[PDB]
Each structure stands twice: as C-alpha cells, then as structure tokens.
Amino acid sequence: AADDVNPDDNKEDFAVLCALAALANLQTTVPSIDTSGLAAYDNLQQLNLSLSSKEWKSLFQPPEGFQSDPTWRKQWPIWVTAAAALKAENKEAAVLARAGLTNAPEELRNRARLALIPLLAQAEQIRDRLSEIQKQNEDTTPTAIAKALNKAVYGQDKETGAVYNSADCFSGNVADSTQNSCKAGNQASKATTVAATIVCVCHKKNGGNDAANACGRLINHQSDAGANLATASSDFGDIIATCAARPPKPLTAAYLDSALAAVSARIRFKNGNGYLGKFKATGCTGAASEGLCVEYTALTAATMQNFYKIPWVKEISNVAEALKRTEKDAAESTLLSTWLKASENQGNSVAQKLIK
Ligand SMILES: *[C@@H]1O[C@H](CO)[C@@H](O[C@@H]2O[C@H](CO)[C@@H](O[C@@H]3O[C@H](CO[C@H]4O[C@H](CO)[C@@H](O)[C@H](O)[C@@H]4O)[C@@H](O)[C@H](O[C@H]4O[C@H](CO)[C@@H](O)[C@H](O)[C@@H]4O[C@H]4O[C@H](CO)[C@@H](O)[C@H](O)[C@@H]4O)[C@@H]3O)[C@H](O)[C@H]2NC(C)=O)[C@H](O)[C@H]1NC(C)=O
Numbered sequence: 001a002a003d004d005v006n007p008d009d010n011k012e013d014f015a016v017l018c019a020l021a022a023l024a025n026l027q028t029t030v031p032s033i034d035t036s037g038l039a040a041y042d043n044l045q046q047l048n049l050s051l052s053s054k055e056w057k058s059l060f061q062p063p064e065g066f067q068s069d070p071t072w073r074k075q076w077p078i079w080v081t082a083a084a085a086l087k088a089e090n091k092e093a094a095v096l097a098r099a100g101l102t103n104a105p106e107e108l109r110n111r112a113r114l115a116l117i118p119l120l121a122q123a124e125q126i127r128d129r130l131s132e133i134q135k136q137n138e139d140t141t142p143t144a145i146a147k148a149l150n151k152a153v154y155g156q157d158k159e160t161g162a163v164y165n166s167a168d169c170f171s172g173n174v175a176d177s178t179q180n181s182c183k184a185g186n187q188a189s190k191a192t193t194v195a196a197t198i199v200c201v202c203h204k205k206n207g208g209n210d211a212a213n214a215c216g217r218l219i220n221h222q223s224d225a226g227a228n229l230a231t232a233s234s235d236f237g238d239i240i241a242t243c244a245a246r247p248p249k250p251l252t253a254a255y256l257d258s259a260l261a262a263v264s265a266r267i268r269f270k271n272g273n274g275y276l277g278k279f280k281a282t283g284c285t286g287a288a289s290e291g292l293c294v295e296y297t298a299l300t301a302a303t304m305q306n307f308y309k310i311p312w313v314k315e316i317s318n319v320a321e322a323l324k325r326t327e328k329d330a331a332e333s334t335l336l337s338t339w340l341k342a343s344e345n346q347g348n349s350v351a352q353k354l355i356k
C-alpha cells in the first residue's frame with residue numbers, strides 16, 4: 001500500500017500550503033512612500049509667493065487670459081494651496097524668518113525671489129516625480145493587501161475575520177463529488193483558494209478507506225469532512241490547527257514569489273493533468289487508493305501560465321507585483337524627499353548671500 005495515500009504522504013506539500021495559509025488575516029506594514037518632500041516643496045512655494053508682488057498675490061481656475069496657459073493650469077492648484085496655507089496666523093512671518101527675510105528691504109525681497117527661479121525649476125521635476133510615485137502606489141496598503149490575501153486563502157474579500165466557509169473556499173460551494181470539488185483551472189473550476197487546496201490535499205473522508213493524517217500525524221482528525229466534503233469545515237479546523245507559519249514582516253514580493261515558485265515546483269504532471277498532493281488513480285476523491293490531491297485539469301508544462309490564472313494564485317501574484325513596485329518606489333521616494341528638504345534649506349539661504 002506504499003502507492004496508496006498513507007499518513008505523512010502529503011506532509012511536505014502541507015508545509016508549503018501552511019506557509020500560504022498564514023497569509024490570511026495578515027497585519028503587515030508596507031513600504032512607505034516618504035512624502036515629506038512634498039511639504040518641503042510647499043514651503044518653497046509659500047516663500048516664493050510671500051516674496052511676490054501685490055499684483056501677483058491678488059490673483060489668489062486661473063484668471064481670464066491664462067485659463068488655457070499650460071503652466072498656469074499646472075501650477076494653479078499648487079499656488080492656491082500655498083496661498084491658503086499662508087493665510088494662517090503667523091505662517092508668513094515664520095516662512096520669512098526661516099529664510100532670513102524678516103523685515104527685508106524691497107530690493108532684497110525681489111532679488112531673493114528671482115534667485116529661487118532655478119532652484120524651483122530644479123525641484124519641480126523632483127516633486128512631480130514624488131507626487132507621481134504617491135499616486136501610483138496609493139492602493140498598495142495593508143488593508144488592500146489583507147483583503148486580497150484573504151480572497152486567496154479563504155475566498156472572502158475582507159480585511160479581517162476571514163474563516164473557513166465552503167461556500168467561499170470552493171467556487172460556488174462544494175461540487176456533487178469530492179473528485180469534482182478538487183479540480184482547478186478548468187471550466188468547472190472549484191478548488192480556487194488555498195483553503196480548498198488544503199481540504200483537498202489533507203481531508204479525512206467519512207465512510208472508511210480514507211487517508212487521514214496524510215498531511216501530518218499530529219493532526220487530530222476529531223471528525224471527518226463527511227461524504228463529498230459535505231462537512232469539510234470541522235475537519236479543516238483540525239488540519240489548520242497544526243499550522244503556525246508566519247511570513248516575514250514586512251511582507252515582501254520576494255517572499256510571495258518564492259512561495260508561489262515552491263508550489264509550482266511541486267506540481268506533477270500525469271495523464272494530461274497536473275496534481276498537487278499524492279495521486280494514484282481515478283481522481284482526487286479523498287480515498288487512499290485513488291488520491292488526496294487537487295487535479296489541475298488539462299494543466300501541462302506548456303500551459304503552466306493557466307496555473308497563475310487560478311484565483312488564489314492570481315491574488316497572491318497581484319499582491320507581489322504591487323509590493324514589487326512599491327518596494328522600489330519607496331526607496332526612490334526616500335532620496336527624492338531628502339533632496340527636496342535640501343532644496344528648502346538652500347532657498348532659506350539665498351538671502352544671506354544676496355545681503356553679503
Ligand atoms: C514664483 O512666484 C512668481 C510670482 O512672483 C511666479 O511667476 C509667474 O510665473 C508665471 C508662470 O511661469 C508667469 O506666467 C507668464 O506670464 C507671461 C505674461 O506675464 C505678464 O502677466 C503676468 C500675470 O499678470 C505677470 O505676472 C507678469 O509680470 C506680466 O505682466 C506670459 O507671457 C507667459 O507665457 C509664456 O509661457 C507660457 C508657459 O506655458 C506659454 O504658454 C506662453 O505662450 C508664453 O510662452 C509662449 O510664448 C512665448 C512668447 O511670449 C515663447 O517664448 C514660448 O516659447 C511659448 O511659445 C507666462 O504665462 C508669470 O509671468 C510670473 N510672474 C512674475 C511676476 O514673475 C512663479 O511662477 C513662481 N514660481 C513657481 C515655481 O511657482
């Protein structure tokens with residue numbers, strides 16, 4: 001009976017699946033876009049406006065004659081924000097004091113503003129890139145990642161409180177038979193979550209002839225999954241009780257990518273299908289003489305791309321791609337914000353040069 005599904009026969013598959021199931025109800029930090037440079041640029045805009053003429057200040061859509069000017073259309077929101085911030089009690093005085101322009105003569109105020117022209121031109125592109133980064137990664141959040149991962153593991157699009165529920169773990173709930181429930185990738189795809197995969201790879205069917213403890217001898221199968229997974233929830237609770245995996249914190253794209261690669265390296269192809277978990281004959285029925293597995297119907301090495309279209313695989317891939325971008329953009333934003341704060345310091349120094 002060595003070719004039958006015996007206890008611990010799916011033990012190593014289960015280790016990988018436990019690592020994936022630990023992505024549920026995840027509370028992770030994400031790489032932060034350092035946007036402190038945006039405030040430094042706003043401070044530079046406020047200095048510039050503070051040093052501007054009464055005619056220019058009185059302007060605060062652009063006025064008639066500049067409504068279609070592309071620079072005014074671009075800058076208007078930035079200028080408006082600077083003007084609004086400067087209206088705050090004592091704000092302008094602080095701006096001018098930080099720049100050494102308190103009670104500055106009119107000639108100095110003018111020369112200082114003009115000296116900011118190339119400074120602001122240099123900072124504009126840096127600030128615009130930082131703002132673009134902020135917008136591009138604004139949906140890479142702990143909440144959105146947790147929801148996507150809970151969709152992957154439990155089929156429940158929620159940030160927390162995700163739990164096993166066959167109605168969500170199997171697409172449209174369990175099928176008429178275990179064999180049909182434990183299929184993914186085909187038209188009638190059912191095992192579309194990590195939890196459904198664990199059920200299919202580890203469950204103890206009722207009726208005898210089961211493969212209890214296939215995923216580990218320390219599982220206490222106190223009940224069973226019923227006939228044709230009708231009561232898989234109780235049995236899943238016992239299986240998952242043995243899993244204590246913890247992903248690295250913060251969660252990284254490299255970790256997720258390696259987890260998915262590991263699964264892909266364990267799927268085995270036979271008779272025109274792919275299988276995760278031990279398969280002997282007929283189907284992934286839960287019977288020890290047939291299989292305790294997911295059948296990736298019609299999956300082949302040449303169609304492996306279709307594995308990555310299975311909902312749980314796609315959800316985790318989406319999270320990994322998003323984190324991949326945000327990791328790089330976060331590292332970029334750190335330098336952009338440092339340069340902008342440096343530009344602010346430079347602008348606060350021009351008065352001392354012009355005076356001397
Ligand atoms: C720091 O704060 C200062 C204010 O103290 C602010 O300066 C102002 O910047 C804007 C945007 O660059 C300047 O807008 C230009 O305005 C002139 C007309 O100037 C008159 O009217 C304004 C408004 O009343 C007065 O402030 C000014 O003193 C004058 O009386 C326009 O002619 C400019 O248009 C050119 O650039 C546009 C950019 O898109 C083009 O679309 C436009 O067609 C013009 O270029 C085109 O034609 C050119 C030939 O004329 C040609 O050379 C080009 O290649 C192209 O074909 C522009 O709208 C405004 O004048 C500035 N005001 C002062 C007092 O300096 C700074 O913007 C602010 N710094 C930052 C970083 O925000």
Ligand SMILES: *[C@H]1O[C@H](CO)[C@@H](O)[C@H](O)[C@H]1O
Pocket residue numbers: 001004209288289290
């Ligand atoms: C299922 O059938 C196999 C032989 O094909 C046997 O080893 C098992 O004991 C039975 O449950």
